Amino acid sequence: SHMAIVKVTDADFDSKVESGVQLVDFWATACGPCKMIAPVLEELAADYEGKADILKLDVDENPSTAAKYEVMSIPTLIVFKDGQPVDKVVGFQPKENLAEVLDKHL
Amino acid sequence: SHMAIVKVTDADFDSKVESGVQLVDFWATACGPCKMIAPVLEELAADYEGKADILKLDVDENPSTAAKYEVMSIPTLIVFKDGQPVDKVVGFQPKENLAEVLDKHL
Ligand SMILES: [Fe+3]
Ligand SMILES: [Fe+3]
């Protein structure tokens, strides 16, 4: 009923993924993209003081909300307008890009 | 130039997310969605034995490959055919959805 997923590394990737059909799960124990986006959001919060709020929710500690908004990877950002979800950004994005997303809804 | 990101939980989401434009970062320290998808992939590996291979790459430990394929959140699943990426699914999906994606390329 279960078979082990085969581990690949930078050293052997090109040899393992060469012929036929492979599905590769890019994963990690810790959330690197979550850490990368955090200071971006802190700078965005300062740039948008008074105009937009920036909040964070840990999905491992808060499964109910994470399930309600169908969060499937992390990080995922949901823009709310007056309590209603109006936009979604999946994964790390540069500050400039997130600003453009906020701007569309201000 | 940095402002603290306000924490929200299952308990207080209703009281905190209510008015104005509000961006919520759904994140975690550990990758809960990565943990949820692993047994699904193990079952898929058994179902597709001898037809497709299922592999995993830890992005923290393997920056070259993670960068080559522009992984921006996790988990990210990429389907390769004869060594070329032909399809991408971002985040946890149920087994039947993943099966449909492999079948398209088999
Ligand atoms: Fe800074
Ligand atoms: Fe900066």
Side-chain angles (χ1 to χ4, degrees), chain A residues 1-2 4-5 8-13 15-17 19-34 36-50 52-67 69 71-80 82-83 85-87 89-94 97-99 101-103 105-106, chain B residues 1-6 8-34 36-48 50 52-67 69 71-83 85-87 89-95 97-99 101-103 105-106:
Chain A
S1 98
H2 288 65
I5 300 162
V8 291
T9 62
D10 283 342
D12 60 18
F13 190 88
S15 79
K16 296 257 175 277
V17 183
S19 187
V21 173
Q22 295 85 0
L23 186 160
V24 178
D25 172 22
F26 290 79
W27 72 288
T29 292
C31 186
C34 301
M36 287 178 60
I37 207 174
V40 170
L41 289 175
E42 285 161 11
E43 289 190 4
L44 199 68
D47 291 338
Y48 287 80
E49 185 170 4
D53 298 331
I54 310 303
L55 298 99
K56 59 181 184 188
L57 179 127
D58 182 321
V59 301
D60 289 354
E61 282 159 14
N62 300 284
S64 287
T65 301
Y69 297 106
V71 178
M72 293 183 284
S73 55
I74 57 176
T76 290
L77 289 55
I78 306 189
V79 180
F80 289 81
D82 289 319
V86 293
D87 221 324
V89 185
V90 184
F92 171 88
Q93 292 268 292
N97 289 337
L98 292 176
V101 172
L102 288 183
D103 282 351
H105 299 285
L106 280 185
Chain B
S1 85
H2 287 235
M3 183 176 282
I5 303 319
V6 168
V8 63
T9 66
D10 282 344
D12 68 3
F13 194 94
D14 59 352
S15 290
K16 298 258 166 285
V17 177
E18 191 157 17
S19 182
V21 176
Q22 293 177 335
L23 184 56
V24 180
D25 175 13
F26 293 83
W27 74 289
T29 304
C31 191
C34 298
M36 293 172 69
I37 211 180
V40 169
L41 293 175
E42 292 165 1
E43 299 169 26
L44 190 67
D47 293 352
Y48 282 73
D53 307 307
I54 317 298
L55 305 179
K56 60 174 176 190
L57 183 124
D58 184 329
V59 297
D60 294 334
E61 293 177 350
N62 299 282
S64 294
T65 304
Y69 297 103
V71 182
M72 301 178 306
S73 70
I74 57 164
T76 293
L77 278 42
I78 297 175
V79 178
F80 287 84
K81 191 181 178 79
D82 295 318
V86 294
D87 212 350
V89 181
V90 188
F92 174 89
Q93 311 263 334
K95 194 177 85 154
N97 291 10
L98 295 179
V101 172
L102 293 173
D103 286 354
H105 306 288
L106 275 173

